[PDB]
Amino acid sequence: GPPGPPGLPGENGPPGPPGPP
Amino acid sequence: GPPGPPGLPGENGPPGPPGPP
Amino acid sequence: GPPGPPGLPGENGPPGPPGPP
Amino acid sequence: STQLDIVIVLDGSNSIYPWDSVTAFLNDLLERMDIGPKQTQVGIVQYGENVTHEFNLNKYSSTEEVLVAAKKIVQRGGRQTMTALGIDTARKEAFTEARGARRGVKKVMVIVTDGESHDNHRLKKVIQDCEDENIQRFSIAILGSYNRGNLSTEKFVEEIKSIASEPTEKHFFNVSDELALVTIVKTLGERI
Ligand SMILES: [Mg+2]
């Protein structure tokens, strides 16, 4: 019949890079 | 009609923004 | 029925460290 | 005595797709593994938001038992993936005598990852620990992000492949590589 419910969202992304020193 | 199962999960999030100067 | 749509991507990662002056 | 202490740590978080993929990879792994009446003890551990244990290391004595156990441990989901906790909890809570580990005969640690190292400090501490204790560590990468273009997945998994300072050809493998599993066993024949 009809399609199922949407999947679960992913996990938090990786940390950002160091700023301009 | 019988509904389908849950969809595929989400991928990991995008990298964080660059740090401050 | 068929599997549901893919889940949303993960949340944006944390900001990077400050550039050591 | 061709016996050895092997642990496999898998993740079933949101970054991982249909568990049929890893169970098929584990299927082919256990199939090639020579799990006799008293040799090749493999423990399957699942991680994510916590570390769950379904079977013990010396809970079986046959390829068929470990193969069934591997596909029996199905992860329905995980809030996050903590690679560093997988390595940590495996060398202590899986490689413990009360959990069926031997007297320390060839400590083999096989872990899967997708690329989510939120803390390199914890994993580096466990790495230096297992490096001093000369544990045979193997890291497998699973690709299941669809890939909507050349986003350079190499720069995403690089963080985990750098865990081992030794040749990546004998430490870092892929889920879609069956020769990788053969490479593990052939090099596991040695004492290190
Ligand atoms: Mg994950």
PDB file of C-alpha atoms and ligand atoms in Angstrom:
ATOM      1  CA  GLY A   1       0.000   0.000   0.000  1.00  0.00           C
ATOM      2  CA  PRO A   2       1.271   3.500   0.954  1.00  0.00           C
ATOM      3  CA  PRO A   3       4.941   4.250   1.838  1.00  0.00           C
ATOM      4  CA  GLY A   4       6.117   4.154   5.462  1.00  0.00           C
ATOM      5  CA  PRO A   5       7.151   7.064   7.735  1.00  0.00           C
ATOM      6  CA  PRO A   6      10.371   9.098   7.126  1.00  0.00           C
ATOM      7  CA  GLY A   7      13.661   7.880   8.630  1.00  0.00           C
ATOM      8  CA  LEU A   8      15.314   9.331  11.730  1.00  0.00           C
ATOM      9  CA  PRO A   9      17.659  12.361  11.357  1.00  0.00           C
ATOM     10  CA  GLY A  10      21.436  11.817  11.531  1.00  0.00           C
ATOM     11  CA  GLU A  11      23.951  12.723  14.246  1.00  0.00           C
ATOM     12  CA  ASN A  12      25.712  16.054  14.951  1.00  0.00           C
ATOM     13  CA  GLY A  13      28.384  17.059  12.423  1.00  0.00           C
ATOM     14  CA  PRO A  14      32.175  17.182  13.031  1.00  0.00           C
ATOM     15  CA  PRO A  15      33.854  20.138  14.874  1.00  0.00           C
ATOM     16  CA  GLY A  16      34.887  23.172  12.804  1.00  0.00           C
ATOM     17  CA  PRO A  17      38.511  24.025  11.899  1.00  0.00           C
ATOM     18  CA  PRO A  18      40.772  26.463  13.870  1.00  0.00           C
ATOM     19  CA  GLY A  19      40.294  30.158  13.135  1.00  0.00           C
ATOM     20  CA  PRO A  20      42.843  32.589  11.570  1.00  0.00           C
ATOM     21  CA  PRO A  21      45.756  33.046  14.087  1.00  0.00           C
TER      22      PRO A  21
ATOM     23  CA  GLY B   1      -3.397  -1.059   1.655  1.00  0.00           C
ATOM     24  CA  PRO B   2      -0.872  -1.775   4.476  1.00  0.00           C
ATOM     25  CA  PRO B   3       1.716   1.044   4.974  1.00  0.00           C
ATOM     26  CA  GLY B   4       5.444   0.376   4.553  1.00  0.00           C
ATOM     27  CA  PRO B   5       8.269   0.441   7.139  1.00  0.00           C
ATOM     28  CA  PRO B   6      10.332   3.508   8.281  1.00  0.00           C
ATOM     29  CA  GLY B   7      12.659   4.993   5.654  1.00  0.00           C
ATOM     30  CA  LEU B   8      16.457   5.163   5.667  1.00  0.00           C
ATOM     31  CA  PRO B   9      18.058   7.263   8.463  1.00  0.00           C
ATOM     32  CA  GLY B  10      19.894  10.556   7.916  1.00  0.00           C
ATOM     33  CA  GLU B  11      23.660  10.913   7.501  1.00  0.00           C
ATOM     34  CA  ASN B  12      26.003  12.788   9.873  1.00  0.00           C
ATOM     35  CA  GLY B  13      25.704  16.563   9.963  1.00  0.00           C
ATOM     36  CA  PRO B  14      27.968  19.035   8.125  1.00  0.00           C
ATOM     37  CA  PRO B  15      31.289  20.308   9.635  1.00  0.00           C
ATOM     38  CA  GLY B  16      31.078  23.268  12.007  1.00  0.00           C
ATOM     39  CA  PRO B  17      32.071  26.829  10.992  1.00  0.00           C
ATOM     40  CA  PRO B  18      35.701  28.092  11.285  1.00  0.00           C
ATOM     41  CA  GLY B  19      36.755  29.561  14.639  1.00  0.00           C
ATOM     42  CA  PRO B  20      37.303  33.298  15.335  1.00  0.00           C
ATOM     43  CA  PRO B  21      40.644  35.189  14.860  1.00  0.00           C
TER      44      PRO B  21
ATOM     45  CA  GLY C   1       4.019  -1.043   1.329  1.00  0.00           C
ATOM     46  CA  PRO C   2       7.386   0.475   0.294  1.00  0.00           C
ATOM     47  CA  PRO C   3       9.873   2.014   2.818  1.00  0.00           C
ATOM     48  CA  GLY C   4       9.408   5.695   3.696  1.00  0.00           C
ATOM     49  CA  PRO C   5      11.602   8.619   2.537  1.00  0.00           C
ATOM     50  CA  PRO C   6      15.169   9.134   3.896  1.00  0.00           C
ATOM     51  CA  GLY C   7      15.587  11.084   7.160  1.00  0.00           C
ATOM     52  CA  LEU C   8      17.061  14.575   7.423  1.00  0.00           C
ATOM     53  CA  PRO C   9      20.860  15.072   7.791  1.00  0.00           C
ATOM     54  CA  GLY C  10      22.382  15.694  11.210  1.00  0.00           C
ATOM     55  CA  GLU C  11      22.744  19.096  12.869  1.00  0.00           C
ATOM     56  CA  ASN C  12      25.648  21.452  12.081  1.00  0.00           C
ATOM     57  CA  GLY C  13      28.814  20.693  14.044  1.00  0.00           C
ATOM     58  CA  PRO C  14      30.248  23.009  16.739  1.00  0.00           C
ATOM     59  CA  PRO C  15      32.372  26.084  15.767  1.00  0.00           C
ATOM     60  CA  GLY C  16      36.146  25.608  15.622  1.00  0.00           C
ATOM     61  CA  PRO C  17      38.684  26.924  18.181  1.00  0.00           C
ATOM     62  CA  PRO C  18      39.911  30.580  18.117  1.00  0.00           C
ATOM     63  CA  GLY C  19      43.141  31.247  16.172  1.00  0.00           C
ATOM     64  CA  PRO C  20      46.016  31.677  18.734  1.00  0.00           C
ATOM     65  CA  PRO C  21      47.419  35.249  18.253  1.00  0.00           C
TER      66      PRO C  21
ATOM     67  CA  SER D   1      47.148 -23.655  19.903  1.00  0.00           C
ATOM     68  CA  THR D   2      45.512 -21.683  17.036  1.00  0.00           C
ATOM     69  CA  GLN D   3      43.156 -19.859  19.449  1.00  0.00           C
ATOM     70  CA  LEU D   4      42.919 -16.097  19.927  1.00  0.00           C
ATOM     71  CA  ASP D   5      40.815 -13.419  21.650  1.00  0.00           C
ATOM     72  CA  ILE D   6      38.865 -11.481  18.978  1.00  0.00           C
ATOM     73  CA  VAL D   7      36.287  -8.735  19.584  1.00  0.00           C
ATOM     74  CA  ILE D   8      34.106  -7.020  16.971  1.00  0.00           C
ATOM     75  CA  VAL D   9      32.533  -3.667  17.904  1.00  0.00           C
ATOM     76  CA  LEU D  10      29.741  -2.460  15.587  1.00  0.00           C
ATOM     77  CA  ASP D  11      27.566   0.677  15.528  1.00  0.00           C
ATOM     78  CA  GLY D  12      23.923   0.870  14.443  1.00  0.00           C
ATOM     79  CA  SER D  13      23.304   4.589  14.745  1.00  0.00           C
ATOM     80  CA  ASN D  14      21.542   6.945  12.315  1.00  0.00           C
ATOM     81  CA  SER D  15      24.808   7.261  10.320  1.00  0.00           C
ATOM     82  CA  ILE D  16      24.507   3.525   9.544  1.00  0.00           C
ATOM     83  CA  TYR D  17      22.068   2.142   6.979  1.00  0.00           C
ATOM     84  CA  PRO D  18      20.141  -1.234   6.994  1.00  0.00           C
ATOM     85  CA  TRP D  19      21.709  -3.710   9.463  1.00  0.00           C
ATOM     86  CA  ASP D  20      21.612  -6.357   6.675  1.00  0.00           C
ATOM     87  CA  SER D  21      24.796  -4.718   5.285  1.00  0.00           C
ATOM     88  CA  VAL D  22      26.985  -5.250   8.387  1.00  0.00           C
ATOM     89  CA  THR D  23      25.426  -8.689   9.117  1.00  0.00           C
ATOM     90  CA  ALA D  24      26.376  -9.744   5.564  1.00  0.00           C
ATOM     91  CA  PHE D  25      29.930  -8.433   6.109  1.00  0.00           C
ATOM     92  CA  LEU D  26      30.101 -10.233   9.489  1.00  0.00           C
ATOM     93  CA  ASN D  27      28.628 -13.323   7.773  1.00  0.00           C
ATOM     94  CA  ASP D  28      31.507 -13.415   5.282  1.00  0.00           C
ATOM     95  CA  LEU D  29      33.993 -12.660   8.096  1.00  0.00           C
ATOM     96  CA  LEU D  30      32.796 -15.510  10.347  1.00  0.00           C
ATOM     97  CA  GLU D  31      32.500 -17.853   7.326  1.00  0.00           C
ATOM     98  CA  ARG D  32      36.212 -17.381   6.510  1.00  0.00           C
ATOM     99  CA  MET D  33      37.137 -17.539  10.235  1.00  0.00           C
ATOM    100  CA  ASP D  34      38.319 -20.960  11.444  1.00  0.00           C
ATOM    101  CA  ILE D  35      36.118 -21.210  14.555  1.00  0.00           C
ATOM    102  CA  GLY D  36      36.812 -24.726  15.721  1.00  0.00           C
ATOM    103  CA  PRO D  37      35.837 -26.526  18.972  1.00  0.00           C
ATOM    104  CA  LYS D  38      38.344 -24.379  20.977  1.00  0.00           C
ATOM    105  CA  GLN D  39      39.903 -21.894  18.532  1.00  0.00           C
ATOM    106  CA  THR D  40      39.137 -18.369  17.251  1.00  0.00           C
ATOM    107  CA  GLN D  41      36.837 -16.822  19.876  1.00  0.00           C
ATOM    108  CA  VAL D  42      34.937 -13.837  18.453  1.00  0.00           C
ATOM    109  CA  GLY D  43      32.749 -11.584  20.611  1.00  0.00           C
ATOM    110  CA  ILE D  44      30.254  -9.218  19.005  1.00  0.00           C
ATOM    111  CA  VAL D  45      29.589  -5.932  20.803  1.00  0.00           C
ATOM    112  CA  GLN D  46      27.297  -3.104  19.700  1.00  0.00           C
ATOM    113  CA  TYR D  47      27.787   0.580  20.589  1.00  0.00           C
ATOM    114  CA  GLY D  48      26.258   3.992  20.049  1.00  0.00           C
ATOM    115  CA  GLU D  49      24.538   5.949  22.834  1.00  0.00           C
ATOM    116  CA  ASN D  50      25.905   3.227  25.163  1.00  0.00           C
ATOM    117  CA  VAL D  51      27.678  -0.142  24.842  1.00  0.00           C
ATOM    118  CA  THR D  52      25.407  -3.194  24.818  1.00  0.00           C
ATOM    119  CA  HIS D  53      26.574  -6.809  25.181  1.00  0.00           C
ATOM    120  CA  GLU D  54      24.429  -9.692  23.927  1.00  0.00           C
ATOM    121  CA  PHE D  55      26.999 -12.531  23.785  1.00  0.00           C
ATOM    122  CA  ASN D  56      30.261 -13.331  25.573  1.00  0.00           C
ATOM    123  CA  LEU D  57      33.623 -14.312  24.020  1.00  0.00           C
ATOM    124  CA  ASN D  58      33.592 -17.964  25.217  1.00  0.00           C
ATOM    125  CA  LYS D  59      29.814 -18.395  24.860  1.00  0.00           C
ATOM    126  CA  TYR D  60      30.253 -20.481  21.676  1.00  0.00           C
ATOM    127  CA  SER D  61      32.627 -23.025  20.143  1.00  0.00           C
ATOM    128  CA  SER D  62      31.692 -23.178  16.432  1.00  0.00           C
ATOM    129  CA  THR D  63      31.510 -20.946  13.344  1.00  0.00           C
ATOM    130  CA  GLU D  64      27.760 -21.561  13.155  1.00  0.00           C
ATOM    131  CA  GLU D  65      27.193 -20.361  16.746  1.00  0.00           C
ATOM    132  CA  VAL D  66      29.215 -17.136  16.288  1.00  0.00           C
ATOM    133  CA  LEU D  67      27.640 -16.552  12.846  1.00  0.00           C
ATOM    134  CA  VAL D  68      24.127 -16.849  14.313  1.00  0.00           C
ATOM    135  CA  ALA D  69      25.168 -14.667  17.276  1.00  0.00           C
ATOM    136  CA  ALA D  70      26.544 -11.995  14.899  1.00  0.00           C
ATOM    137  CA  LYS D  71      23.255 -11.734  12.953  1.00  0.00           C
ATOM    138  CA  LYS D  72      21.237 -12.113  16.187  1.00  0.00           C
ATOM    139  CA  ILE D  73      22.677  -8.892  17.660  1.00  0.00           C
ATOM    140  CA  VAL D  74      20.678  -6.336  15.685  1.00  0.00           C
ATOM    141  CA  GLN D  75      20.873  -2.680  16.647  1.00  0.00           C
ATOM    142  CA  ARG D  76      17.546  -0.894  16.121  1.00  0.00           C
ATOM    143  CA  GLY D  77      19.193   2.539  16.445  1.00  0.00           C
ATOM    144  CA  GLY D  78      21.763   4.703  18.190  1.00  0.00           C
ATOM    145  CA  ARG D  79      21.546   8.392  19.176  1.00  0.00           C
ATOM    146  CA  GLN D  80      25.217   8.929  18.319  1.00  0.00           C
ATOM    147  CA  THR D  81      28.396   7.053  17.448  1.00  0.00           C
ATOM    148  CA  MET D  82      31.275   7.222  19.906  1.00  0.00           C
ATOM    149  CA  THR D  83      34.211   5.382  18.302  1.00  0.00           C
ATOM    150  CA  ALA D  84      36.440   6.192  21.311  1.00  0.00           C
ATOM    151  CA  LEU D  85      33.964   4.518  23.700  1.00  0.00           C
ATOM    152  CA  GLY D  86      33.814   1.423  21.450  1.00  0.00           C
ATOM    153  CA  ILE D  87      37.599   0.851  21.681  1.00  0.00           C
ATOM    154  CA  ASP D  88      37.623   1.686  25.434  1.00  0.00           C
ATOM    155  CA  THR D  89      34.736  -0.597  26.407  1.00  0.00           C
ATOM    156  CA  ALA D  90      36.052  -3.420  24.189  1.00  0.00           C
ATOM    157  CA  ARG D  91      39.561  -3.718  25.710  1.00  0.00           C
ATOM    158  CA  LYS D  92      38.189  -3.661  29.284  1.00  0.00           C
ATOM    159  CA  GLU D  93      34.545  -4.859  29.332  1.00  0.00           C
ATOM    160  CA  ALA D  94      34.886  -7.280  26.355  1.00  0.00           C
ATOM    161  CA  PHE D  95      38.484  -8.477  26.942  1.00  0.00           C
ATOM    162  CA  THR D  96      37.724  -9.415  30.540  1.00  0.00           C
ATOM    163  CA  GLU D  97      38.068 -13.013  31.808  1.00  0.00           C
ATOM    164  CA  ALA D  98      34.530 -12.984  33.293  1.00  0.00           C
ATOM    165  CA  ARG D  99      33.221 -12.164  29.772  1.00  0.00           C
ATOM    166  CA  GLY D 100      34.903 -15.288  28.322  1.00  0.00           C
ATOM    167  CA  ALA D 101      38.288 -13.766  27.391  1.00  0.00           C
ATOM    168  CA  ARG D 102      41.328 -16.050  27.674  1.00  0.00           C
ATOM    169  CA  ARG D 103      44.646 -15.343  29.440  1.00  0.00           C
ATOM    170  CA  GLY D 104      45.499 -12.795  26.694  1.00  0.00           C
ATOM    171  CA  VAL D 105      46.320 -14.828  23.575  1.00  0.00           C
ATOM    172  CA  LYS D 106      46.384 -12.482  20.534  1.00  0.00           C
ATOM    173  CA  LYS D 107      44.082  -9.566  21.411  1.00  0.00           C
ATOM    174  CA  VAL D 108      42.329  -8.725  18.124  1.00  0.00           C
ATOM    175  CA  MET D 109      40.060  -5.670  18.063  1.00  0.00           C
ATOM    176  CA  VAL D 110      37.913  -5.099  14.966  1.00  0.00           C
ATOM    177  CA  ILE D 111      35.785  -1.912  14.970  1.00  0.00           C
ATOM    178  CA  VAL D 112      33.579  -0.295  12.315  1.00  0.00           C
ATOM    179  CA  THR D 113      33.087   3.476  11.794  1.00  0.00           C
ATOM    180  CA  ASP D 114      31.582   5.926   9.278  1.00  0.00           C
ATOM    181  CA  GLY D 115      33.404   9.167  10.234  1.00  0.00           C
ATOM    182  CA  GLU D 116      32.203  11.003  13.345  1.00  0.00           C
ATOM    183  CA  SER D 117      35.214  11.576  15.647  1.00  0.00           C
ATOM    184  CA  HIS D 118      33.874  14.375  17.877  1.00  0.00           C
ATOM    185  CA  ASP D 119      36.740  13.852  20.352  1.00  0.00           C
ATOM    186  CA  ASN D 120      40.184  12.704  19.233  1.00  0.00           C
ATOM    187  CA  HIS D 121      41.508  12.859  22.835  1.00  0.00           C
ATOM    188  CA  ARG D 122      39.646   9.804  24.186  1.00  0.00           C
ATOM    189  CA  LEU D 123      40.496   7.641  21.140  1.00  0.00           C
ATOM    190  CA  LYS D 124      44.194   8.646  21.258  1.00  0.00           C
ATOM    191  CA  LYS D 125      44.406   7.627  24.913  1.00  0.00           C
ATOM    192  CA  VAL D 126      42.885   4.202  24.176  1.00  0.00           C
ATOM    193  CA  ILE D 127      45.138   3.933  21.097  1.00  0.00           C
ATOM    194  CA  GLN D 128      48.366   4.589  23.050  1.00  0.00           C
ATOM    195  CA  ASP D 129      47.149   2.091  25.697  1.00  0.00           C
ATOM    196  CA  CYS D 130      46.479  -0.725  23.201  1.00  0.00           C
ATOM    197  CA  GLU D 131      49.705   0.244  21.357  1.00  0.00           C
ATOM    198  CA  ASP D 132      51.781  -0.326  24.525  1.00  0.00           C
ATOM    199  CA  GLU D 133      49.888  -3.585  25.165  1.00  0.00           C
ATOM    200  CA  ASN D 134      50.577  -4.487  21.450  1.00  0.00           C
ATOM    201  CA  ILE D 135      46.939  -5.199  20.618  1.00  0.00           C
ATOM    202  CA  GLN D 136      46.093  -6.002  16.993  1.00  0.00           C
ATOM    203  CA  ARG D 137      43.629  -3.230  16.072  1.00  0.00           C
ATOM    204  CA  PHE D 138      41.633  -3.265  12.822  1.00  0.00           C
ATOM    205  CA  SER D 139      39.364  -0.417  11.729  1.00  0.00           C
ATOM    206  CA  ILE D 140      36.756  -0.966   8.998  1.00  0.00           C
ATOM    207  CA  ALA D 141      35.004   1.915   7.246  1.00  0.00           C
ATOM    208  CA  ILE D 142      31.406   1.618   6.060  1.00  0.00           C
ATOM    209  CA  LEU D 143      30.144   3.786   3.200  1.00  0.00           C
ATOM    210  CA  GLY D 144      26.401   4.468   3.333  1.00  0.00           C
ATOM    211  CA  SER D 145      25.908   8.230   2.928  1.00  0.00           C
ATOM    212  CA  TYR D 146      24.678   7.948  -0.735  1.00  0.00           C
ATOM    213  CA  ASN D 147      27.351  10.505  -1.807  1.00  0.00           C
ATOM    214  CA  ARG D 148      25.743  13.421  -3.725  1.00  0.00           C
ATOM    215  CA  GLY D 149      29.074  14.281  -5.401  1.00  0.00           C
ATOM    216  CA  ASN D 150      32.823  14.366  -4.737  1.00  0.00           C
ATOM    217  CA  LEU D 151      32.634  15.714  -1.180  1.00  0.00           C
ATOM    218  CA  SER D 152      35.941  13.871  -0.484  1.00  0.00           C
ATOM    219  CA  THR D 153      34.847  11.094   1.906  1.00  0.00           C
ATOM    220  CA  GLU D 154      38.605  10.425   2.338  1.00  0.00           C
ATOM    221  CA  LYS D 155      38.821  13.643   4.415  1.00  0.00           C
ATOM    222  CA  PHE D 156      35.908  12.431   6.572  1.00  0.00           C
ATOM    223  CA  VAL D 157      37.249   8.952   7.471  1.00  0.00           C
ATOM    224  CA  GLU D 158      40.928  10.118   7.578  1.00  0.00           C
ATOM    225  CA  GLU D 159      40.537  10.928  11.296  1.00  0.00           C
ATOM    226  CA  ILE D 160      39.942   7.240  12.077  1.00  0.00           C
ATOM    227  CA  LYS D 161      42.514   5.799   9.616  1.00  0.00           C
ATOM    228  CA  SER D 162      45.205   7.919  11.357  1.00  0.00           C
ATOM    229  CA  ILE D 163      44.512   5.932  14.613  1.00  0.00           C
ATOM    230  CA  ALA D 164      47.095   3.374  13.491  1.00  0.00           C
ATOM    231  CA  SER D 165      50.613   4.602  12.719  1.00  0.00           C
ATOM    232  CA  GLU D 166      51.368   1.179  11.155  1.00  0.00           C
ATOM    233  CA  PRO D 167      50.571   0.445   7.423  1.00  0.00           C
ATOM    234  CA  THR D 168      46.894   1.142   6.652  1.00  0.00           C
ATOM    235  CA  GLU D 169      46.888  -1.855   4.249  1.00  0.00           C
ATOM    236  CA  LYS D 170      46.921  -4.111   7.346  1.00  0.00           C
ATOM    237  CA  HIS D 171      44.759  -1.940   9.658  1.00  0.00           C
ATOM    238  CA  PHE D 172      42.203   0.041   7.672  1.00  0.00           C
ATOM    239  CA  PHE D 173      39.678  -1.824   5.534  1.00  0.00           C
ATOM    240  CA  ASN D 174      36.317  -1.328   3.803  1.00  0.00           C
ATOM    241  CA  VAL D 175      32.981  -3.156   4.208  1.00  0.00           C
ATOM    242  CA  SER D 176      32.800  -3.693   0.422  1.00  0.00           C
ATOM    243  CA  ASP D 177      36.240  -5.420   0.460  1.00  0.00           C
ATOM    244  CA  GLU D 178      36.220  -9.192   1.062  1.00  0.00           C
ATOM    245  CA  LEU D 179      40.023  -9.377   0.485  1.00  0.00           C
ATOM    246  CA  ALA D 180      40.307  -7.063   3.474  1.00  0.00           C
ATOM    247  CA  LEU D 181      38.918  -9.853   5.691  1.00  0.00           C
ATOM    248  CA  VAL D 182      41.413 -12.307   4.139  1.00  0.00           C
ATOM    249  CA  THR D 183      44.209  -9.782   4.838  1.00  0.00           C
ATOM    250  CA  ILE D 184      43.135  -9.737   8.523  1.00  0.00           C
ATOM    251  CA  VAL D 185      43.308 -13.551   8.941  1.00  0.00           C
ATOM    252  CA  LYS D 186      46.579 -13.965   6.991  1.00  0.00           C
ATOM    253  CA  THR D 187      48.286 -11.340   9.181  1.00  0.00           C
ATOM    254  CA  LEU D 188      46.528 -12.670  12.336  1.00  0.00           C
ATOM    255  CA  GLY D 189      48.504 -15.891  11.756  1.00  0.00           C
ATOM    256  CA  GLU D 190      51.565 -14.024  13.117  1.00  0.00           C
ATOM    257  CA  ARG D 191      52.091 -13.144  16.800  1.00  0.00           C
ATOM    258  CA  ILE D 192      51.440  -9.429  16.051  1.00  0.00           C
TER     259      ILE D 192
HETATM  260 MG    MG E   1      26.514   7.328  13.945  1.00  0.00          MG
END
